[PDB]
Structures are given as C-alpha cells and as structure tokens.
From a paper:
Usb1 is an exoribonuclease that shortens the oligo-uridine tail of U6 snRNA, resulting in a terminal 2′,3′ cyclic phosphate group in most eukaryotes, including humans. Usb1 is a member of the 2H phosphodiesterase superfamily, a large enzyme family containing members with known 2′,3′-cyclic or 1″,2″-cyclic phosphodiesterase (CPDase) activity, or 3′-5′ or 2′-5′ phosphodiesterase activity, or 2′,5′-RNA ligase activity. The active sites of 2H phosphodiesterase enzymes are characterized by a symmetric shape with two HxT/S motifs centered in a catalytic cleft. We report three high-resolution co-crystal structures of Usb1 complexed with RNA, which show the structural basis for this catalytic preference and unambiguously identify His120 and His208 as catalytic base and acid, respectively.
Numbering used by the authors: 78 to 265
Amino acid sequence: MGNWATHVYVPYEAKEEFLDLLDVLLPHAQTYVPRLVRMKVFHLSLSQSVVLRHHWILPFVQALKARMTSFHRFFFTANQVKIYTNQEKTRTFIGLEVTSGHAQFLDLVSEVDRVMEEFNLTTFYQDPSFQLSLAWCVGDARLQLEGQCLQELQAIVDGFEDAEVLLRVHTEQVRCKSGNKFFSMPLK
Ligand SMILES: [Cl-]
C-alpha cells in the first residue's frame, strides 16, 4: 500500500489580480535570487507534512471532513512579506504571513491536530505561524532576501490597492493532500 505524504491546508483561490501582483513581486525578488521559482498553487498550511499508511487515507480524510464541515468561512489578512526556510535550511520561501484571521487559523489547526492525534500523527508547529507561500528556492537564501529585498517587496504589497486580494481574503475550503491525491472539503 505504502506510506503517503499527507498535508492539510487552506487553499487560496488565486485570481488574476493576485497572479499579476506576483508577476511583479517574483521578478523583483529574482533580481536578488534569480533561482526563485513561483509556487504553482497557493495555500496556507494547517499541518506538518506527515506520512500516513495508505489504508488510513480515506478514514483520515473523512475524519477531517467531519470536523472541518462545522467550521465557518472567515476572513484573513496576509500582506506581511516574510522570508523563511524549512527546518534543514535547504529551501527558502517568500510568503505572506497572516495577521488578522490568525486566530481562526489556530482554531482550524486545533481541529486538524486532533485528527492528527487520532491517527498518531505529529500535531502542528510549536510556534504557529500561517503563511501563504509565493515562491521558493533551493538552499538558504535568507541573507539575500531579508533586508533591502524584503523591504522593497513589502512596499510593493503595501502599494497594492484591492483589499479583496490580500487584506480581506475569504476562506472557502480545507484540503488534504495525500500522495498524489487531493481531498477538498468546504467550510461553512
Ligand atoms: Cl540564484
């Protein structure tokens, strides 16, 4: 059956305005670190990447559905640019950290963590932050991206006028990736 990489997140339903903004942010960042790559899809993590035995994928998804189904949609703000790495410092990310709405993400995490525990999986990061990743690169490029680049990225974001794109984002769904499979579920 195998063990399958499993991750729970909140998709971000990117539309043209956001993608066009990223068309400016990413080349800006690439003047500092050319090898940055745009994310293909956008989401905010609610869990670590864990592994689940194949037999438990559908039960895990159904456990999530049962919990997530009662959780209402909500609004968040993600307009604070951040540079971060993975734990091993072998990948660097540019993302947008959630400010308003963080508390609602924490409530989602509390439910996901319960499902994780129900299946013996690791619960969420001990220092929770939520962020919408925009781009990544191999290696540790924090020093190149933090400082002037970050400030300039933030100023691009701060100059962006349509509040619905980053300032008042209305969540819609939670999704669970397991291997190559993606299981969606609505928020109320
Ligand atoms: Cl590079």
